[PDB]
Design goal:
Structural class of chain A: alpha/beta
Number of strands of chain A: 10
Largest sheet of chain A: 8 strands, parallel
Radius of gyration of chain A: 18 Å
Strand content of chain A: 15-25%
Helix content of chain A: 25-40%
CATH architecture of chain A: Alpha-Beta Barrel
Oligomer: homodimer
CATH class of chain A: Alpha Beta
Number of helices of chain A: 9
Number of domains of chain A: 1
Chain lengths: 251, 251
C-alpha cells in the first residue's frame, strides 16, 4: 500500500456565497454545506434579515455552529443612501463580523470611507460584469477605491471579471492589496454572452487562480456563487466543489 | 484574456456503475448522468430485467440515447449455475453488449470459458474486498483466470482492492491484460474497516491511477460505484465526479 500525495497547502478558505441558496432556507443551506465539508457562509438577508433581534442572531449563530459553519461576512448588501449604509454597518457589528460585501452607489464611497474608520471593518465591493453599469470589473473598483481608506476594496468575482473581458488572475496580481473577498464560479465565454456553468466545464483558469492566490498570499474566502439551475442547483454545486477541491489539492 | 491549459487526454471513458442508483428508477438515473455529462452506464437488472421483451429492450436503448447515454455492459450479474450463465450470455446478446460484469462461483469458471468462446464476449469478474470469501482482490481473480481464455478477467474495483490491503495502481500495472472494467470509488482506510467516501476525501491515489491507465493504455470504462448515502446520494455522486474530472484533466 502506497499513500497518495499530501494535499497542497493553500492560504485561502473555501466558502459559499449566500445567493447560491436564494431559493432555499437556512436549514437546507447549512445541511448542504455540512455534507460538502464547507465551513464558511457569507450571510444574506434572506437567511438573516437586517432587523433580526439579538435572540434571532444568537439562534442563527448556534444553528451555524451546529452544522460546523461560520458566518464570515455579510452581503452583498446594496446601499443607495447613507441610511442604508448606517444600517448595514450596525447590522455587521450586531452579527459579529468585520467584513461587509457591498454595492454602494459611487457617490456614497466617501461615506463608506467614514464608516470603515468608525467601525474598523473591511468593505468588499461586488463587481458585476458587463451587464451592469456600476463596478463592471476589478479595474473599475480599483480606480474608485485606490485613493480611499485601505479597508475598502473588492469582492473579486472571477466570472463577472472574465465576462467583462478581463483576466481575473492578472487582476488579482495587480489588485491583491484591495481584494478582501472572492466569488468563485465558472463561465462559458469571456464576454457578456458567457453564462454560468459547473466549475471545470467553463473558461476560468482555476489552476492559475490557485497559484496566484499562493503567490500574493490571499487569506480571504473563495466563496462559490453558483448561478445555474438555481431552482435545483445541488448537483451543480457539488460537482463544482469537487472540481475546485481537486484543483486546490493538486496544483 | 489568457486561455486555461488544455485538458489532458485519457484513454479511458467515465461511466456510472448501476448499483449507485439501486434505490432509483432508470428515469432518475439517466437524468442524473445527463446533468453530470456522463455518457456511459453499466446496466443492472433493477433497470433492465433479464426477461425484458425485445420491445422493452428497444425502449431502454431509446431512452438511454435520448439522455446521451450508452449502456456499455451488463452487470454485475451473480451466477451460481450453468443455467444462470446461459441466461446472462443470451441477455447480453439481446441487449447488444459485448462485455459482461459477473460474479460466477469458482467451479463455474470453465463454463464461463466455454461461453466466452461461443459468444466472443469479454467477461469481467467483480472483486469484492475483505468481507467476501470469493474474489476478494485483483490477485485472486488473476490466479483463477490467467490460464483460461484471454477474454476472462476482472472488474478492477479500486476501493475493494485497497480495503483488502492491495495497491490498486500496482495491481493495474501487473494485471492490465485482464482488466476489462473498473469501478472507481474512494475509501477511508486500506482495511476492512475502510468505508466509502466521496472521491478525493479518502485514501485512493487517483493521480497515480490516472497516470497508470495512460501507461498501460486502459481503454475501458471507469464507472463510479458510489456506496455512501445510498438513499440520497446525489450530492456525493456529483462531488466525486467533479473531483475525478479534475484529476483526469490536470494529471
Amino acid at each position: 500500500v502506497k499513500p497518495k500525495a499530501p494535499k497542497a497547502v493553500n492560504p485561502f478558505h473555501l466558502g459559499m456565497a449566500g445567493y447560491t441558496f436564494v431559493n432555499f432556507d437556512l436549514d437546507t443551506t447549512l445541511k448542504t454545506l455540512e455534507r460538502l465539508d464547507i465551513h464558511y457562509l457569507c450571510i444574506k438577508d434572506f437567511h438573516l434579515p437586517l432587523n433580526s433581534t439579538d435572540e434571532q442572531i444568537r439562534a442563527f449563530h448556534d444553528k451555524c455552529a451546529a452544522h460546523k459553519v461560520t458566518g464570515y461576512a455579510v452581503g452583498p448588501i446594496y446601499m443607495k443612501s447613507e441610511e442604508e449604509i448606517d444600517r448595514a454597518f450596525d447590522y455587521a457589528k450586531r452579527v459579529g463580523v468585520k467584513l461587509i460585501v457591498g454595492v454602494p452607489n459611487y457617490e456614497l464611497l466617501p461615506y463608506v470611507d467614514k464608516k470603515v474608520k468608525e467601525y474598523d471593518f473591511h468593505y468588499a465591493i461586488h463587481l458585476h460584469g458587463p451587464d451592469i453599469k456600476t463596478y463592471p470589473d476589478a479595474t473599475d473598483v480599483w480606480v474608485h477605491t485606490k485613493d480611499l481608506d485601505p479597508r475598502i476594496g473588492m469582492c473579486l468575482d472571477v466570472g463577472h471579471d472574465l465576462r467583462n473581458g478581463c483576466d481575473p488572475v492578472a487582476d488579482l496580481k495587480k489588485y491583491h492589496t484591495r481584494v478582501f473577498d472572492m466569488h468563485i464560479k465558472d463561465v462559458t465565454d469571456s464576454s457578456k454572452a458567457g453564462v454560468g456553468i459547473e466549475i471545470g466545464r467553463g473558461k476560468i483558469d482555476f489552476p492559475a487562480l490557485i497559484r496566484m492566490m499562493r503567490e500574493v498570499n490571499y487569506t480571504g474566502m473563495c466563496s462559490l456563487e453558483y448561478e445555474k439551475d438555481m431552482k435545483d442547483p445541488f448537483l451543480g454545486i457539488a460537482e463544482s466543489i469537487g472540481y475546485f477541491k481537486a484543483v486546490s489539492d493538486l496544483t
